[PDB]
Amino acid sequence: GKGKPRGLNSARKLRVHRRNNRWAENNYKKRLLGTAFKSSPFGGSSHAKGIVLEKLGIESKQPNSAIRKCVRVQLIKNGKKVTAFVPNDGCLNFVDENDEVLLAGFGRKGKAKGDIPGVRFKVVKVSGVSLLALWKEKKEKPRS
Amino acid sequence: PRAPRTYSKTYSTPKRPYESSRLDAELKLAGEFGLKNKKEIYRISFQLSKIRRAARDLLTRDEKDPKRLFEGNALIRRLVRVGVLSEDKKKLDYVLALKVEDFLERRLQTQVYKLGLAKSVHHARVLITQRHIAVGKQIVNIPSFMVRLDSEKHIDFAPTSPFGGARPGRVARRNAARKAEASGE
Amino acid sequence: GWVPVTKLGRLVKAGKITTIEEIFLHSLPVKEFQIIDTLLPGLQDEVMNIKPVQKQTRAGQRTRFKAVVVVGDSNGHVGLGIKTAKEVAGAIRAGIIIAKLSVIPIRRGYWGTNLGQPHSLATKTTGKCGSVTVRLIPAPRGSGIVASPAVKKLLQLAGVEDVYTQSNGKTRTLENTLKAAFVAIGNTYGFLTPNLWAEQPLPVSPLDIYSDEASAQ
Amino acid sequence: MAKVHGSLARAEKPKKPKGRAYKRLLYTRRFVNVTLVNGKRRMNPGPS
RNA sequence: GGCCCAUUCGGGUCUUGUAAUUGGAAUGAGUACAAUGUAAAUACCUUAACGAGGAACAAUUGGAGGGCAAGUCUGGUGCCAGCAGCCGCGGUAAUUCCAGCUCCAAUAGCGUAUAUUAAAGUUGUUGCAGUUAAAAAGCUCGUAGUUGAACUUUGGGCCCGGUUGG
Numbered sequence A: 001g002k003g004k005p006r007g008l009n010s011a012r013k014l015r016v017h018r019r020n021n022r023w024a025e026n027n028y029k030k031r032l033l034g035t036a037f038k039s040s041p042f043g044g045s046s047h048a049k050g051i052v053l054e055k056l057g058i059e060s061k062q063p064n065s066a067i068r069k070c071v072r073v074q075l076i077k078n079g080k081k082v083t084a085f086v087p088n089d090g091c092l093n094f095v096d097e098n099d100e101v102l103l104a105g106f107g108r109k110g111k112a113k114g115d116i117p118g119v120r121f122k123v124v125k126v127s128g129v130s131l132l133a134l135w136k137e138k139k140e141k142p143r144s
Numbered sequence B: 001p002r003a004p005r006t007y008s009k010t011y012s013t014p015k016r017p018y019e020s021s022r023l024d025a026e027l028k029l030a031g032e033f034g035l036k037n038k039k040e041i042y043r044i045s046f047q048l049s050k051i052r053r054a055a056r057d058l059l060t061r062d063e064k065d066p067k068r069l070f071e072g073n074a075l076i077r078r079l080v081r082v083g084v085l086s087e088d089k090k091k092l093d094y095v096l097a098l099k100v101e102d103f104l105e106r107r108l109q110t111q112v113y114k115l116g117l118a119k120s121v122h123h124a125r126v127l128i129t130q131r132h133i134a135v136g137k138q139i140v141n142i143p144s145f146m147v148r149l150d151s152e153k154h155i156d157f158a159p160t161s162p163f164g165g166a167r168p169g170r171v172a173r174r175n176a177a178r179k180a181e182a183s184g185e
Numbered sequence C: 001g002w003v004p005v006t007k008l009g010r011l012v013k014a015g016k017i018t019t020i021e022e023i024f025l026h027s028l029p030v031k032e033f034q035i036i037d038t039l040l041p042g043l044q045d046e047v048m049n050i051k052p053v054q055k056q057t058r059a060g061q062r063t064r065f066k067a068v069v070v071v072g073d074s075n076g077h078v079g080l081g082i083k084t085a086k087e088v089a090g091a092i093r094a095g096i097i098i099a100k101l102s103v104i105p106i107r108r109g110y111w112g113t114n115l116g117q118p119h120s121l122a123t124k125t126t127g128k129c130g131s132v133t134v135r136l137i138p139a140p141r142g143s144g145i146v147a148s149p150a151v152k153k154l155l156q157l158a159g160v161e162d163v164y165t166q167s168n169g170k171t172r173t174l175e176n177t178l179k180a181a182f183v184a185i186g187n188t189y190g191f192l193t194p195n196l197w198a199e200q201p202l203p204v205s206p207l208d209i210y211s212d213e214a215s216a217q
Numbered sequence D: 001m002a003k004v005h006g007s008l009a010r011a012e013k014p015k016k017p018k019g020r021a022y023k024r025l026l027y028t029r030r031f032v033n034v035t036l037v038n039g040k041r042r043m044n045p046g047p048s
Numbered sequence E: 001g002g003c004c005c006a007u008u009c010g011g012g013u014c015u016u017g018u019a020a021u022u023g024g025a026a027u028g029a030g031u032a033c034a035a036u037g038u039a040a041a042u043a044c045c046u047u048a049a050c051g052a053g054g055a056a057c058a059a060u061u062g063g064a065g066g067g068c069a070a071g072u073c074u075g076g077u078g079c080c081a082g083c084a085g086c087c088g089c090g091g092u093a094a095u096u097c098c099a100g101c102u103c104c105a106a107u108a109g110c111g112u113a114u115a116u117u118a119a120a121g122u123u124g125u126u127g128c129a130g131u132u133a134a135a136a137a138g139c140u141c142g143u144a145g146u147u148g149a150a151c152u153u154u155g156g157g158c159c160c161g162g163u164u165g166g
Helices: A011-018 A026-033 B020-032 B039-058 B066-082 B092-097 B125-129 B149-154 B172-179 C007-013 C021-025 C034-039 C088-101 C149-156 C174-181 D020-031
Strands: A048-059 A067-075 A081-085 A100-105 A121-126 C044-057 C060-072 C078-085 C125-129 C132-137 C163-168
Touching: A048 A081, A067 A100, A081 A100, B020 B039, B020 D020, B039 B066, B039 B092, B066 B092, B066 B149, C007 C034, C034 C088, C044 C088, C044 C149, C044 C174, C060 C088, C060 C149, C060 C174, C078 C088, C078 C174, C125 C174, C132 C174, C149 C163, C149 C174
Parallel strands: A081 A121
Antiparallel strands: A048 A067, A048 A100, A067 A081, A100 A121, C044 C060, C060 C078, C125 C132, C132 C163
16 A cells, blocks of 8 residues: 555645655755855855965875875955865975965865875965966966 | 846757768768858757757647647748758658758759859858859848748849959959059060 | 588578578578578668777787678668677678678567558567666657657668667666567567457478578588 | 057957857868878878 | 769869968958037947958966866976865875966856755655655543535436537
8 A cells, every 4th residue: 555645635745755755855854954154164055265274295105106286375354274186286386385376176075095085185276377377378467 | 127138049069069971961961061160060960959959849749739839830831932842742750850951952052053153062062151152132141041932032243243243353453453553664 | 702611501502492481481590690681682781879888908908899780771681780890890790790690680560550551560569688678659640759869770770661669778888778679579460469360371491492402512 | 578669540370260260161171172181180280 | 071073093072181382352459520319418329530351459267087068288396286066086106286289168257255036746735655775652541723425306208499410
């Protein structure tokens, strides 16, 4: 008999069980409780600006092994701090500090059995100039 | 404030991007007819796939049902008036097997090459763009005119173009101003 | 050359059977692949998937090659077989012969009204094998075939122009998917529709009208 | 590095043709001629 | 190549291929007398004179093991190595990093980020899951809520008047 009621005047059990155990869909519970403000470092935004504390070097332990270059930062609207990532100056020659930077996220989920370890962010521009415009060398960093 | 101005989008891309048996039949239409990109071929499949949907449900409701008779005999009447349905195929089931080049063979780029004015299908789209061809009295310059049926027979050159009319362009005038005055010196 | 060694084969070598439908009416078993070739000369194949597969005999890893081959007309006849073999080009040609051996018809009907040829299926049908289900549904004109590419290619060679599919189950082991679309076609002759309600008398087999012929020495 | 500001227009390889003419070129290079490698097919190949 | 005169030539018809091999025609982007527009102007429609071999009046973003269209190509001492959503590719010469060449896709890129919808029969009324895979409460009485056997005027006769196959 399927283990659910079928008769005609039964619409109240049917609609009150459905929102009862709709709380196991994993990203409907995130939306009604609203955990995007209370826990996320961004608060619900695409990008965010911070100011860089210092250069860091991080490594990936099991099967892979090389020299992943990341950066500390401190967000202006929040005060909390995160560790971003800068893409492929694999030459080890773009340290920069006490600068204004713009982060973003990865399209995130991954595999860290090679231990490409636990950061969640990246960098799209720095001090008012895009990153690729420096790597492809279309601008150079503004200063006097 | 004021009233808002309606608009609509006119094409739609397909669901699977890189699969090969699609990609070639689109290519062989773009070389056959000379079309700029594949947005021009999506433009003709959209317009078709709303015609097909419009007849797809008048077939469901009964015959001798006065919405089938008023909206049917107008949809049929408009497709013949531009010349896509054959004149013996005036029945509503026959539009459900219409194809996409039965509209592609009615553009001005295609109906001027068949009617003997340009030596190739790429001599059409450059003849039209440069204001040479004029159905009726009106210089058109759009390679997608979709000529109505009882005005296939009016296309000719323009009463302003150097081909079918008056003064030559500013090469021949410039060449005559490069040689005829230079005959003495 | 061709020596028939089965007593159906002598009847068709001598040319007492002109269409394949006499095999299908009295439902006769077929065991020689040359019978189909003279009967249906327009038959035509493609290969779907070729996969190396492995057996750890003597801890010596000997390679086989499984092949999935569909043969078929563009009128109403299909076929499908699978064969593993030691060498690649043997598995294709051995895979064709089982597919030539298993040919079935398909009832092709209309959607709605009755103008001209049949295009779509007669009713809705379903076959399941393994864990996959596949269900086929009639469609109007202009529809085309909406299926996965491995199943759309099957239904071209049976020549259905418009049909609607809907498939459940783990559809990512294609040896089992095609073995469900196959069952879901071959049931189309088997649903007793109401026009097939009338009565007819039983015909008699060719295997005893021509009994003096096609008999061994 | 940057753009040059003086581009006023009042008063190694040869080019490719850009636009509808490029669709004409591709129509020839795969549908008016042929390329095989012994029936088996590796068109637009590596030179060997 | 090609259809053919083929004798065999070339006798025709073609199709490309290319020859910094050669010729002449077309034209608006732009500029600008007038007129028209407009409350006055600016611009779009119309139009004197001017305006190209175009090599310069020069299309761009992203990729070329797999999913998923596209390379068996040469160069680093690993100049300028984790490495590309996820399986993974590095321990010299790599069928993926860094660059040159040639190809592919969209042509004004949907390139990246974050939300949501389809894919999803992974929210299931239509429509899922019962033993071994997540999942039937220790056991019977019993609220509200949901759900509850069959039966009480059928048949017969006459006659008018609809639109359909005719």
